[PDB]
Write an enzyme that holds these catalytic residues in place. Sequence first.
Site, mmCIF file in Angstrom:
data_model
loop_
_atom_site.group_PDB
_atom_site.id
_atom_site.type_symbol
_atom_site.label_atom_id
_atom_site.label_comp_id
_atom_site.label_asym_id
_atom_site.label_seq_id
_atom_site.Cartn_x
_atom_site.Cartn_y
_atom_site.Cartn_z
ATOM 1 N N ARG A 76 67.828 17.907 65.034
ATOM 2 C CA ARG A 76 69.312 17.966 64.913
ATOM 3 C C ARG A 76 69.729 19.259 65.559
ATOM 4 O O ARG A 76 68.971 20.208 65.705
ATOM 5 C CB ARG A 76 69.825 17.925 63.493
ATOM 6 C CG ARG A 76 69.264 18.999 62.628
ATOM 7 C CD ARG A 76 69.752 18.838 61.217
ATOM 8 N NE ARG A 76 69.272 19.889 60.329
ATOM 9 C CZ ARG A 76 69.649 20.021 59.060
ATOM 10 N NH1 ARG A 76 70.510 19.171 58.487
ATOM 11 N NH2 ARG A 76 69.180 21.024 58.341
ATOM 12 N N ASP A 133 64.100 21.713 59.705
ATOM 13 C CA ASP A 133 64.282 22.583 60.860
ATOM 14 C C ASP A 133 63.056 23.415 61.102
ATOM 15 O O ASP A 133 63.145 24.656 61.143
ATOM 16 C CB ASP A 133 65.567 23.392 60.671
ATOM 17 C CG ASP A 133 66.815 22.533 60.501
ATOM 18 O OD1 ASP A 133 66.862 21.352 60.881
ATOM 19 O OD2 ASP A 133 67.863 23.083 59.982
#
EC number: 3.1.2.-
Length: 397
Positions: free
Chosen positions: A322, A262
């Site tokens: 994601r 991330d």
Amino acid sequence: YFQSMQRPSDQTAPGTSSRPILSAKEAQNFDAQHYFASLTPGAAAWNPSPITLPAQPDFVVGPAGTQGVTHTTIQAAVDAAIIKRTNKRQYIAVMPGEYQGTVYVPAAPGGITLYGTGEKPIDVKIGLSLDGGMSPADWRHDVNPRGKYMPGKPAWYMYDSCQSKRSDSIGVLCSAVFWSQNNGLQLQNLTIENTLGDSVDAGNHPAVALRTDGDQVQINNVNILGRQNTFFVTNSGVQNRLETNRQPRTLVTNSYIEGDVDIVSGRGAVVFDNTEFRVVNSRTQQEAYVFAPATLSNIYYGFLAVNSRFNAFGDGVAQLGRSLDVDANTNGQVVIRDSAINEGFNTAKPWADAVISNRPFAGNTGSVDDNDEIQRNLNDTNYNRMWEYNNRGVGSK
């Protein structure tokens, strides 16, 4: 008419359920002017002019005793800028060196520009090691030596929102080395690193390098270095938490952003132009995700990467992103366009299931109607909102 020798992207709409590809018509809605749109009517989109440096800065941060230095820490110079209570932009030059400690830039009526004066961005290094899993006591010790933050100094409200926590761990939203709420922040020609690096294992270790919550923020020729959650944008106000009715706009140009899990996360409209994204596998070899948008499901614009470069080490492990499903009304949005995706990515499943909710990735390939035009609602909550258009490179196929 002779044939252009230009190599066409091999990415053709509508793509697949695993890798949806926008049509030209769809992609017209996904450019910087749409991401930067105002909310008032009568109001033009934000079109920022490039950062312009003054002939003389307002403040100079550098080693003690060096000519022209005003301050020896960056926080002290920021504080000196903020106490003026001015609407005019202030410029803080930072001399080559290593500057250990947090930098908190508060909301203020005027913009702050912080810029390095080295030959390269790596010449000015701003860093500290902070982990979201760390105890508040350990956090307070590391962030606030010698009364750096005290009631009545600028940025108290920022520090106090974290330091008051009595939870076991301080959390990702307090792990930032550099945290700005200043509208109009400009950063140029410097490096910001959460130096936790490879001192920890492959598990959850949020360690934000740069957090920005301000609107109209410009980051140009900066290196942002981390592992998990390197760059975090949020729409927080003074309460230090994600909000439901604020859409800050950020432009990141000509920059380098490194991490693993991330790498670019959060809520806000962010445009990345000519930015290089590098996935590293020194801390974890099992997973990597470049983008983790937390975009609200009623908001159409999350992240846009344009004319950017994506590089990953390992053997097809890394993924483009994601969704960061922080709450029920989130459906992260990202478009990667006109970009080079090089070796190292998972080309069969470039988008992973959502974090937090484990919502399976679902790409919308739509349908065709009269005279063969792809139709799909790009904001359908039944599917993800992670898209590509006109990318190139081995990782684009």
